[PDB]
Symmetry: C3
Subunit: 415 residues, 3 copies
């Protein structure tokens, strides 16, 4: 383990170097602010270089993922799996938003805000939604343009685009190959910047540690943040999933919880939703007698497009950062956070600590200071390893639920 | 006819429901204006959702239509048909603009305005012409940017694009198939919104009926509007087409008018330029002895890209709406209306009442309030059925004129 | 030569007509300024019509040129030729900028300007870099948006795009053919406007001659400009290339200079880097005994993507025009001029006087008045014919240098 996972070693060296350089330069002096910005400048280069690559990334991944990979699944298993997967993620995101508003760390009318949301959902002109959002000002009222991206309009129009390409069928094969080429090129350009990343994260940690003005209250609210995400994760993966199992299936949930309770240990141990599939296959198809005809369809897709924990942690860590810089949020933006939590949970998957890459979608959707993500990155070496456990549990309970809903269908397709 | 044409029944129910809800709520009270906007809100959603789909619609239809469908017609019949078709539409649009300025319902220098037009025709930067127009302000003068789309610059550049793709030939077959795929996808997404449409048109009729402040003067100017479009249609389809026949052909026009005078009845009866082709083929190739070698080329394309009536009605109903809200127009915009009347007549064709879809190109070109189109939609159940008659007559007279211009060419290609 | 090169004859007639019309109308009267703008208006139409075609031209030429034409050259000859070609052009551009700042014709902090440059190099949102640049204003400081294109961000991102398409290999053949089609279409649309060009250049010469307010001081600084570019060309093609030859090769440079000294005469005579290849092949492969295995790779590509003279003349004629209208330039823009001199030298090649087409990239990168290029176009009939000589010499010295660096490689690939 000395030379393997070279990027992990480099990020550890970067965080350690940035922490000790902060510990030197904070005890150095009251610093001139422009040399502080000059020191934090590689972090700003990393943030601007990564926000460069969410416009072709959304556009390419939405049309590669939707049309071309929904192509003729099982007629009932596909829609049941998709209903469960877009149900539990939305429920987890609403639970995360409710918890981070209730605990409250980090210490126009509402009807016009929700009309503002519905107006921003359907964009007027397309190129005037790649960089400008419509908002409502006072005097009567009028509607003008604030800066910042409009993520909801693009995701709405391109979801309608991908679905309308799926129903054309075999005629459109000069387009899905084009967008697969575009997605592969954009992903290689993301790999380049993620190889550059640790020198950016070191300077950003230094820039957020030197100019922080207090070394205690930030640690207090960070501990409060970790308390919030732990309590949200345990209330979801303890109450909300076995209740959904018990309402529909009318079976005892702990008897299902036994085999996943032995798989859950290595799920915590390896922190990957992709690493635990050879374990959970031997767990699920043997310890509970689940049919082979449904697990090969509902588990490997469930390890990718269904991660409740990376919705909970993401939608809590957005409104934490909003409640650090004083920017209170209204109902025209809480729905944006709770929807792009769903639309940013399904993207970045199958890897340890992928919540610190797909956060940059939400941190530009709601219109927030993007350059404060480093106060997350020091406290995620303990947080991801239990988040992946709920990512595993949310796939296993769906593998139970779809199988109990379609046992009759499997038996009538037998004979 | 009870269940057939389901969208027509739903639009009738929507207009009737919106009219009776206006007749209730106007006699209800002086209404608070924000609940009036809340009631009219689905109409605003329909308008913004339809202005979402004119940027890929123009871009896709211009390059699907030009390069790929001009591919090797007859060498003389094609250019003669195109000269006649882009002649009579421009003449009809100028006649409509002149009539609606003369009757005048709805009760910077000019040289700098025309320089402003020529500057907006050739756009400086392409992405700064999808959402911003260049205008000239006072103090010396200077040139700055007003908001609103620039339709003329995009239509100019993409017409040059489609023509420059037509002259490349067989090399570019990885592009025209791409844009055919894009056009089919955008047309299916238009079909979705036109299925949503009647619930939008009902709420927009309610929002324009409640806040109208007078129930008599608007009906007076609407009757004046119907008078203007009827007088323009009769002066065009009575004088201007037989004069063009009589100058070139030196033949009596009523003898040509006999067979189209019996086809004209079912042309008024069915209100479609596509429904009258099996009638007008039996009329034209038999009652006048027109050659089969030219009618199969000049009639079915003439039923699509040559509709003088949907230029006249369109270019009158734009400057009516401009003269309702007081916005007087100058020569930097009258040319925009009279040119996009031509470039919006050739697009939306072969259907009853297609002038209430392609109006939204002109209503965003000239920079007008788009949300007042519903005062057209109550008075078009009587206006379209005679407009399609002139659409038929404008194809039949061209079928006569091109045949008389190329009778010698047909006889010398015989032997 | 009476009817051949018809565009050259038309440009000569246009320049002569514009000069004599200036010589009449300057001795006519103090002119009203708006009819002066009306006379100069076709030149403004030509400038806006040509700035229309640098956004698809950069995007198409960068991905046609990079991926698809670097495909498996020689493993060492390719990188040695590319190192020499991107070395001498950058050295020539820095020498040109230094000379035009030193002679000085035409009579925020710097650290924040260079941070502004690094911020504009990596663009935040892509569509907000096709028309808007980020700049830093005072009060603390803040960062806002000035108008004007951002050329460096697009060239950076699309260079990374073309390189990341080159490493994918055979999978992406539905993209490079698409962008070859786009490049051919955009080049035909450039051919159309270059056929329109002389009527534009005549009116622009009239508009810059009538409103010039002095007939002597402009000629004095134009003579100073010609002095600057001649002195820069002679110091480069006399000192800097034989020094680079003599440091590495340790051979006498005049013995190499003999055969190119007889080729140099017809290089001055025909003013084309494409016309002198049959001469320089017989010169180089015979008079110096250079191997056939390297000249067929390093000469015909060197006649296209390596022109030091069209970097020197270009990067001097940009900062001349900046120093005519008083607009002094700082270090946030001098790097932009000296980099887009390199990235605009490699594009427009193999033709007499191609520096008056690719100038319009730099004249919109630095944010300058584009409509003053005509004071170049009267004094380039004497300047291009010696510029092409240095274009030839810069290829011949590289053909010597790469051959001496790889003589051992050629001998070990022999046996
Ligand atoms: C640094 C920047 C980071 C930004 C992160 C962006 C990541 C992507 C965010 C966008 C999310 C969507 C991308 C596409 C899905 C992931 C890509 C993928 O590989 O999928 C694998 C997966 C196929 O798996 P594979 O075969 O293993 O590739 O794709 C799917 O089958 C599911 C795709 C779902 C698409 C998202 C749906 C969200 C909206 C839910 C509503 C659905 C329509 C409702 C209609 C109205 C009611 C009738
Ligand atoms: C809700 C939004 C509604 C917006 C409505 C937009 C509808 C399209 C508006 C844009 C109009 C152009 C679209 C393309 C034509 C219609 C599409 C089509 O199906 O065509 C069928 C037709 C082929 O018929 P088919 O074979 O039955 O499909 O296409 C044509 O052959 C004619 C295309 C004409 C294109 C418009 C020309 C207008 C400019 C006239 C000047 C011509 C060049 C002059 C050069 C300078 C002088 C030398
Ligand atoms: C009116 C508007 C005028 C505007 C003028 C724009 C003209 C193009 C300007 C953009 C210049 C780039 C265009 C592409 C090259 C010319 C096109 C062409 O035909 O090439 C022929 C040539 C192939 O020749 P052929 O086979 O005869 O076509 O292409 C090449 O092989 C060289 C292409 C070089 C591309 C430019 C490189 C400049 C950046 C240098 C850094 C390189 C990466 C460093 C990586 C970091 C360090 C590891
Ligand atoms: C769909 O949109 C998104 C959004 C955010 C994203 N974040 C990411 O990390 C990645 C990821 C990556 N990117 N950078 N490094 N890795 C891995 C580390 C590594 C790279 C090279 C050598 C050794 C280790 N790739 C690169 C390669 N992976 C491999 C997949 C199996 C397990 C790890 C290796 C996956 C995909 C994709 C991604 C896609
Ligand atoms: C080129 O750019 C444009 C601009 C404006 C446009 N307006 C439109 O109406 C349409 C039209 C449509 N769209 N929505 N409904 N229809 C028909 C009603 C219907 C639909 C489904 C079931 C029963 C009835 N389509 C849909 C299908 N048509 C069919 C064509 C033969 C006659 C009617 C049916 C034509 C094309 C295209 C169009 C294209
Ligand atoms: C890569 O980006 C760029 C940037 C700036 C550019 N400037 C240009 O001049 C051209 C050039 C052109 N364009 N217009 N005229 N020519 C030639 C004059 C001519 C045309 C027709 C008949 C007789 C003479 N073409 C057109 C055709 N050439 C031919 C090539 C061999 C020598 C001359 C003829 C070259 C390419 C391309 C170009 C590409
Ligand atoms: C928010 C910005 C700074 C991105 C976060 C930067 C760092 C911390 C992120 C970006 C990409 C991530 C890496 C992506 C891939 C792997 C391979 C896996 O086997 C171990 C984790 C590891 C090594 C991740 C560790 C954390 C990581 C290096
Ligand atoms: C003004 C805006 C809202 C667009 C107009 C909305 C409604 C009235 C328009 C849009 C599309 C139109 C329909 C398009 C297609 C058909 C099929 C035809 O056989 C009967 C008419 C009918 C059913 C049209 C009726 C009017 C229509 C429904
Ligand atoms: C600043 C704008 C107007 C560009 C300059 C306009 C004129 C002077 C430019 C544009 C294109 C140029 C031409 C491009 C091609 C050729 C063919 C070559 O065998 C002789 C030179 C000649 C004829 C060039 C002469 C100068 C030229 C005509």
């Amino acid at each position: 383990k000395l030379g393997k996972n070279l990027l992990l070693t480099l990020t550890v060296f970067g965080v350690i170097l940035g922490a000790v350089c902060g510990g030197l330069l904070r005890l150095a002096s009251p610093i001139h602010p422009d040399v502080v910005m000059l020191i934090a400048f590689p972090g700003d280069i990393l943030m601007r270089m990564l926000k460069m690559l969410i416009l072709p990334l959304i556009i390419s991944s939405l049309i590669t993922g939707l049309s071309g990979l929904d192509a003729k699944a099982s007629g009932r298993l596909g829609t049941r799996a998709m209903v469960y997967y877009m149900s539990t993620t939305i429920i987890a995101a609403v639970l995360g938003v409710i918890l981070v508003l209730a605990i409250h760390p980090g210490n126009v009318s509402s009807l016009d805000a929700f009309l503002d949301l519905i107006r921003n959902l359907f964009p007027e002109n397309l190129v005037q939604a790649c960089f400008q959002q419509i908002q409502t000002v006072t005097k009567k009222k009028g509607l003008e343009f604030k800066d910042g991206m409009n993520v909801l309009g693009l995701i709405g129009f391109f979801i309608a685009f991908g679905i309308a390409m799926g129903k054309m069928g075999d005629q459109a094969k000069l387009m899905v190959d084009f967008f697969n080429i575009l997605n592969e090129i954009v992903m290689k350009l993301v790999i380049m910047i993620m190889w550059y990343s640790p020198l950016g994260i070191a300077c950003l940690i230094c820039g957020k540690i030197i100019a922080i003005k207090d070394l205690e209250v930030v640690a207090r609210q960070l501990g409060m943040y970790m308390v919030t995400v732990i309590i949200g994760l345990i209330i979801h993966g303890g109450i909300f999933l076995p209740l959904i199992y018990f309402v529909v299936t009318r079976k005892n949930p702990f008897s299902f919880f036994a085999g996943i309770f032995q798989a859950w240990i290595t799920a915590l141990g390896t922190a990957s939703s992709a690493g635990t599939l050879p374990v959970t296959f031997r767990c699920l198809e043997e310890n509970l007698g689940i049919d082979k005809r449904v697990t090969r369809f509902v588990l490997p897709v469930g390890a990718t497009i269904n991660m409740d924990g990376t919705a909970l942690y993401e939608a809590v860590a957005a409104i934490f950062i909003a409640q650090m810089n004083g920017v209170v949020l209204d109902g025209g933006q809480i729905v944006t956070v709770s929807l792009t939590a769903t639309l940013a949970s399904v993207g970045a998957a199958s890897i340890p600590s992928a919540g610190l890459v797909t956060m940059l979608l939400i941190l530009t959707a709601v219109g927030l200071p993007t350059e404060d993500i480093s106060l997350l990155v020091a406290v995620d070496w303990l947080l991801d390893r239990m988040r992946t456990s709920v990512n595993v549990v949310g796939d296993s309970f769906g593998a139970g639920i779809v199988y109990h809903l379609s046992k009759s269908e499997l038996d009538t397709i037998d004979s």
